[PDB]
Amino acid sequence: ASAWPEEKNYHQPAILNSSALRQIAEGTSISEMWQNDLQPLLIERYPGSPGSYAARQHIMQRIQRLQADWVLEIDTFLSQTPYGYRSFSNIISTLNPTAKRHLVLACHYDSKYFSHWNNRVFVGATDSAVPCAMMLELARALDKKLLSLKPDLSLQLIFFDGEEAFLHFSPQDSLYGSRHLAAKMASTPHPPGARGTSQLHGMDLLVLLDLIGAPNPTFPNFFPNSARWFERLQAIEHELHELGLLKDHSLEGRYFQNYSYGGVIQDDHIPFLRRGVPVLHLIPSPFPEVWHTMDDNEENLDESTIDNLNKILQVFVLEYLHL
Ligand SMILES: [Zn+2]
Numbered sequence: 001a002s003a004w005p006e007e008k009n010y011h012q013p014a015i016l017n018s019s020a021l022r023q024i025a026e027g028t029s030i031s032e033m034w035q036n037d038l039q040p041l042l043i044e045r046y047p048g049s050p051g052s053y054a055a056r057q058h059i060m061q062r063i064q065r066l067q068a069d070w071v072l073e074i075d076t077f078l079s080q081t082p083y084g085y086r087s088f089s090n091i092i093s094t095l096n097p098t099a100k101r102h103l104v105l106a107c108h109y110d111s112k113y114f115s116h117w118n119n120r121v122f123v124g125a126t127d128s129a130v131p132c133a134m135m136l137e138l139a140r141a142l143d144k145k146l147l148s149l150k151p152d153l154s155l156q157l158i159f160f161d162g163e164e165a166f167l168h169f170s171p172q173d174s175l176y177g178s179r180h181l182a183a184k185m186a187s188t189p190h191p192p193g194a195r196g197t198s199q200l201h202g203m204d205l206l207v208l209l210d211l212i213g214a215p216n217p218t219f220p221n222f223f224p225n226s227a228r229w230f231e232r233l234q235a236i237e238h239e240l241h242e243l244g245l246l247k248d249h250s251l252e253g254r255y256f257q258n259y260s261y262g263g264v265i266q267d268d269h270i271p272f273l274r275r276g277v278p279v280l281h282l283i284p285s286p287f288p289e290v291w292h293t294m295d296d297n298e299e300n301l302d303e304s305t306i307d308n309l310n311k312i313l314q315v316f317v318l319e320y321l322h323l
Contacts, residue, residue: 006109008205011151016318022243032137037133044122046111047087059091059109062139063093063136066140067147075090077180090158090159094155095154098191099152104156105157108268110163110176123296125296127291128163130306131209133305142323145318185200205280208269211291214290214301215302218284221256221259226278227245233256281318
């Protein structure tokens with residue numbers, strides 16, 4: 001009976017020194033992300049729409065162009081909705097699919113369905129086009145390091161479809177792609193051939209990004225079983241700050257603050273959390289003021305905050321992976 005699914009409990013980061021921290025800060029490009037990864041996603045893309053198809057193609061092509069050996073899988077399924085049976089497609093991008101353990105970064109790539117209203121279209125810029133582009137930018141910026149992976153531990157990106165309710169949130173109308181994928185992963189032996197362990201035992205940590213891109217986010221430390229990873233984000237933010245590697249940033253207005261939050265936020269981590277996967281939920285509290293309005297658009301995004309968060313997240317992921 002291997003104890004391998006316990007390794008994530010003892011796993012420690014390999015901390016980057018100052019010079020490596022400067023190298024990561026310099027190797028990410030907020031303007032290249034903006035033009036190449038973000039803008040093509042700033043389109044209507046509710047499930048089943050032609051924009052959901054265009055978003056999925058864009059996400060797959062951006063990953064396919066990279067040197068690291070990503071394996072793309074489209075997980076397509078039917079679910080009942082308030083509009084009847086519909087099809088949804090999660091995107092999963094994995095380095096070393098047979099590696100036993102993965103660090104998982106995730107967001108939702110659908111946009112909430114709304115009728116056009118006075119010629120305005122909801123594009124969910126923070127929710128979650130920006131998280132999607134941050135994951136693509138991280139894949140691009142870290143591509144030479146990730147190529148080296150070609151701890152039996154690697155990296156996986158999930159872009160969930162159907163996170164949003166077609167109406168308002170209810171247990172049967174929301175989290176379509178995550179409820180499906182969590183169930184599918186919990187019932188899939190892993191590594192291949194295993195008798196008793198599932199792809200969920202293999203998920204060291206689910207890092208779910210959502211509602212990112214507004215000014216002054218504050219992420220609370222939601223869960224005791226990922227609290228020590230939340231502390232790593234605080235330490236990385238603090239050290240990048242002290243090195244002069246963040247922009248328009250102060251420690252009084254730091255993003256990763258010392259405070260917990262007792263309540264439940266409904267989001268794509270829920271079906272994983274309820275099956276015992278550790279989650280680091282990178283959603284701010286309070287939500288962006290533009291949340292679920294037509295003003296959640298490109299013009300209300302805060303470029304230097306996204307840039308700073310790309311740096312902190314890329315550093316977190318290298319340190320976790322010992323790269
Ligand atoms: Zn939303």
